[PDB]
Ligand binder design. Structure first.
Ligand SMILES: OC[C@H]1O[C@@H](O[C@@H]2[C@@H](O)[C@H](O)O[C@H](CO)[C@H]2O)[C@H](O)[C@@H](O)[C@@H]1O
Length: 409
């Protein structure tokens, strides 16, 4: 007998159950293998995985944020090198770069699922505001015009803010800036992933355009006090006409209707992020699976990773979590005719961009999460009036620390 244990990060209200619903076909076909999941929340996962990699007090397998894979894989003796042990031909090509350490041929993770952030909107709010959501969000400038018409629009006598986005420190702080920087024609690092470049003229143009949506009263300023989960909940309670969110919120809003009669789910659509002067760009994230080098059943652990990559497990995991599969064949399933999920798939395939898969990137995100949240503190005027000039200084200070981190490699 073999007791396979794995850590998972939560994106639903029942993560352990969702997972067991997906691996049940595997366990029914391998009676000598048991699988026990354990939840590790996102804010603790990097610290916990890093500690477990060196102490050996670890499960056999852990989910890992795609942007962290290289950081963990670069830890000597931390993970099983998967190079050649998994068949990557079946995978969506673009998902594989985050499974390797950039500049090496070393694959330390297997892509598990993909996610991007799309523009959710209230159909009823748009109709009343005279906003056509199929056309009026297409570009930065049209998006901004639409927000002005949606600002303070009322549905059933309650005012909505035009755009609700979090500003508090969680991992999504940098993710929510990413595609504004990209769409302006900037990037976080050079091609090699070895120096920071997000104080460039173009990067700052994107930072200024996005952050000043709140200065101008279009993005809701009080919501910048809150984190992603709180703003997701607020949108589900009707607080905002629009919000940029991942696909998993659809599970939450569907449950809110089933349990509470909250019909928000029936009032929303989703469209791609607005196009900037560089063309359209979107955040590409998701998670990979890795096998700890300390695993005493690497044969079974590797067997379980291959099952998670099977067409049926990918379809079923996508159904329960709303995440996108990383296996091309899953998308032939009728389920992906869904009007909302189609948007996330088209956006990530055509316009998705993932960070450089470098070992220092995980540590960089810690600095991004604290550093860039100071931009929202500036906008929120908690220490003096807002000024763009203070944002520029915040960004330059973050860049210096990122460069020192990248130089450790
Ligand atoms: O930056 C770490 C990893 O973040 C992942 O995004 C998570 C979101 O899906 C979730 O909704 O919120 C948490 C924070 O509470 C985010 O960490 C990305 O999918 C990964 O690509 C990324 O490595």
């Amino acid at each position: 007998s073999v007791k396979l244990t794995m850590w998972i990060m939560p994106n639903s209200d029942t993560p352990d159950q969702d997972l067991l619903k997906v691996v049940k076909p595997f366990t029914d076909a391998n009676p000598h293998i048991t699988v026990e999941p354990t939840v590790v929340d996102w804010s603790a996962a990097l610290t916990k995985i890093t500690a477990a990699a060196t102490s050996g007090e670890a499960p056999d397998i852990t989910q890992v944020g795609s942007t962290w894979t290289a950081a963990i894989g670069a830890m000597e003796g931390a993970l099983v090198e998967l190079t050649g042990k998994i068949d990557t031909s079946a995978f969506v090509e673009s998902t594989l770069q985050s499974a390797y350490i950039k500049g090496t041929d070393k694959m330390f993770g297997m892509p598990w699922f993909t996610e991007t952030r799309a523009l959710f909107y209230r159909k009823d709010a748009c109709e009343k505001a005279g906003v056509n959501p199929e056309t009026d969000f297409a570009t930065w400038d049209k998006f901004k015009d639409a927000l002005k018409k949606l600002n303070g629009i009322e549905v059933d006598g309650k005012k909505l803010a035009a755009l609700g986005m979090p500003g508090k420190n969680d991992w999504n702080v940098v993710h929510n800036f990413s595609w504004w920087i990209y769409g302006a024609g900037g990037d976080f690092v050079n091609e090699e992933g070895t120096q920071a470049t997000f104080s460039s003229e173009n990067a700052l143009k994107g930072i200024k355009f996005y952050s000043e949506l709140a200065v101008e009263g279009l993005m809701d300023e009080p919501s910048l006090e809150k984190n992603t989960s709180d703003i997701e909940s607020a949108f589900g309670d009707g607080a905002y006409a629009t919000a940029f969110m991942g696909p998993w919120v659809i599970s939450s809003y569907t449950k809110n209707k089933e349990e509470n009669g909250n019909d928000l789910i029936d009032k929303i659509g989703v469209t791609m992020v607005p196009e900037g002067p560089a063309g359209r760009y979107a955040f590409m994230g998701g998670s990979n699976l890795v096998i700890f080098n300390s695993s005493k059943n690497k044969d079974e652990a590797l067997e379980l990773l291959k099952f998670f990559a099977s067409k049926e497990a990918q379809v079923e995991y996508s159904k329960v979590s709303k995440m996108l599969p990383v296996v091309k064949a899953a998308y032939e399933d009728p389920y992906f005719e869904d009007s909302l999920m189609k948007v996330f798939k088209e956006q990530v395939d055509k316009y998705g961009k993932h960070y450089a898969s470098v070992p220092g990137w995980a540590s960089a995100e810690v600095i991004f999460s604290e550093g860039l949240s100071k931009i929202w503190d500036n906008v929120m005027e908690v220490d003096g009036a807002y000024s763009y000039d203070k944002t520029v200084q915040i960004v330059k200070d973050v860049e210096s620390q990122i460069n020192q981190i990248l130089q450790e490699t």
